[PDB]
């Protein structure tokens, strides 16, 4: 029973599901693949994802009703994926934006080419609030490309890393769009710099969950024990508000 | 990975472990049997279990450190087993006594021969506080012996039932001390009146966890699906603060 801590399943709030039907379909697929817990982390990002918090709550609650139709033992928790801009700090401290399952952990996102010093500075200011940043899809940031020294630094301040399930997969030979993130992801896993693997699922045409598959690949390359850590135990600790 | 929502693992606080050594030994056994989550529910009972709440917290936190020695993926949550006396209501509402994992659920206990009207009255007054009572070892109460009508009533007010793992086991032919609770437990399982099975573990000489075994017996008699509900899914919902 996997716990997916990064998901876009709330409808009409961001670039995830546009309808209830689409939300129900996502949940169902996630369930097929063995996920029994999903943390909703819709986008909060000044400039492009500014849906009112009240509306996200409204729709999330509806999605939690829908989950019941998929399966009685599917647990939906609230949360958020937060794109760092300065305003975000007070919003977090005052609790106007959710942490993951109301725990100490917050899912934090940057741009592909955010300079390292900006990522670092931002993550410091969040730690100052007593909140623990889990860094969203570290494969994305150029700042961290092939750079363990920098990732260790962040982990050692008190951050934890998340990698997307789809970037654990192997590169295709025709029509690959994520060569660099797949290469980057594989490097972090080799260096043992990954705490969590999550789906970042948005839909069932382009951004599905690849959790079942990502799990079998990590099992083979890195061992069953590591797959369980990244896909179950560490997420378990996050959702239970305990330090990993 | 089972979740045990009823446990006496804090030392020098009640009739559970008397030492750290004994606490560590309990955790370890529970882990052997496949339990990955344990809710601490030490005794709060006017008249015989009156250890100051500050002291229970102090020692619980230490037990949570010890758990790390047993295994990194063992999660210890705080809670309490509450013996109903009137004072308990305000203590709960004001939060001077913990609910299970700080959820809406509280583990509630009575005496073997508490008349039904007293159990009922007490459980009403707790529901009035917005708290959901999970009834501790229902096998114990004479009021509920062979009496589905009464158990359904309670469940329908909004209570949930817990049965002890050791009372799921088969009766012995020499030196059985729990014939009646084993018979009673078996009856509730047949009538499908049990939401949760938990250990009520106190030690490793007389009151061990019988979770591994209780799980295999429920599997055989009632199906894998039911064992998972009682030993994993329903407890999962309790610890995640979601209505079962
Ligand atoms: Mn998106
Ligand atoms: Mn993102
Ligand atoms: Mn995302
Ligand atoms: Mn006891
Ligand atoms: Mn008891
Ligand atoms: Mn007990
Ligand atoms: Sm290295
Ligand atoms: Sm490691
Ligand atoms: Sm019946
Ligand atoms: Sm049932």
Numbering used by the authors:
A (entry chain A), B (entry chain A): 0 to 243
Publication passage describing the model:
The function of these proteins is crucially dependent on phosphatases, which are homologs of either Cps4B in Gram-positive bacteria or WzbK-30 in Gram-negative bacteria. Since the dephosphorylation of bacterial tyrosine kinases, such as Wzc and CpsCD, is a crucial part in the capsular assembly process in both Gram-negative and Gram-positive bacteria, the phosphatases represent potential targets for drug development efforts. We have thus characterized representatives from each family: Wzb from E. coli K-30 (denoted WzbK-30) and CpsB from S. pneumoniae TIGR4 (denoted Cps4B). Furthermore, we show that both Wzb and Cps4B are capable of completely dephosphorylating full-length Wzc, establishing that Cps4B activity is not confined to its cognate CpsCD complex.
We solved the structure of Cps4B in two crystal forms, P212121 and P43212. Both structures are identical with the exception of loop 169–177, which shows a significant conformational change between the two crystal forms, indicating a degree of flexibility in this part of the structure. The loop is involved in crystal contacts in both structures, but it would protrude into the surrounding solvent if the protein was in solution. Loop βF/α6 shows a significant conformational change between the two crystal forms P212121 and P43212. It is close to the active site and contains several hydrophobic amino acids that could potentially form hydrophobic interactions with the incoming substrate (e.g., Leu172, Phe173 and Tyr177). Although this loop could be important in binding the phosphotyrosine, it does not confer any specificity of Cps4B to CpsCD, since our results show that Cps4B readily dephosphorylates Wzc from E. coli K-30.
